[PDB]
């Protein structure tokens, strides 16, 4: 299980994909996940939500024609989701947030 | 079956709106109070079915300078994405 900022960041840069311990919101749901229950770890042990498209709604991350952003949960083990996320783009720019998207820090 | 109410005439800031949503939706204490935090809460935290009743929308649209519209847009996209959300605009 790779779920730390630099572990996932380096992995994204080296393999152009998230580690295997990541599944999208729809995949988690197909497995019985109910966010309000905080049962992700029960329905998919060792898994964390990640891989879904990030719409960059506040326009905080650098937007460019042709660039799409995606996000993934960081430091999640079990129970309810936390406030940490790693954000990666199609051209591999990497950012992180630890305050539920209020601010971001470029790490790659 | 989660119910949420917004009395628009009482919203004087975009912050008022986000703090109101935090309470009515039972969002996490770390709730980012922004469009991206809202999308994440509606799609990976909030309980469904959900019913959002937004009263005096127009009035709240004024004191938030079209920010209310962007908030509503997130609920609608969360809805088109599969979320069982019923939106009442009165």
UniProtKB/Swiss-Prot annotation, chain A:
Coiled coil: none annotated. Keywords: Endonuclease, Genetically modified food, Hydrolase, Nuclease, Secreted, Signal. It is an enzyme of class 3 (hydrolase). The active site is at 71 (proton acceptor), 100 (proton donor). Its EC number is 3.1.27.-. Introduced by genetic manipulation and expressed in male sterile maize and rape by Plant Genetic Systems and in radicchio rosso by Bejo Zaden. Barnase expressed in transgenic plants will specifically destroy the tissue(s) where it is expressed. After cell transformation, protein expression and plant regeneration, the active nuclease destroys the pollen producing organs thus rendering the plant sterile. One of its GO terms (cellular component) is extracellular region. Changing residue 100 to Q: Loss of activity. It is found in: Secreted. It comes from the Bacteria. One of its GO terms (molecular function) is RNA endonuclease activity. Hydrolyzes phosphodiester bonds in RNA, poly- and oligoribonucleotides resulting in 3'-nucleoside monophosphates via 2',3'-cyclophosphate intermediates. Belongs to the ribonuclease N1/T1 family. This is Ribonuclease. The lineage of its organism: Bacteria, Bacillati, Bacillota, Bacilli, Bacillales.
UniProtKB/Swiss-Prot annotation, chain B:
The keyword Protease does not apply. The keyword Cytoplasm applies. Belongs to the barstar family. InterPro entries: Barstar, Barstar-like_sf. Pfam families: Barstar. This is Barstar. Disulfide bonds: none annotated. GO terms for cellular component: cytoplasm. It is found in: Cytoplasm. CDD domains: Barstar. Keywords: Cytoplasm. Inhibitor of the ribonuclease barnase. Forms a one-to-one non-covalent complex. It comes from Bacillus amyloliquefaciens. Its main location: cytoplasm.
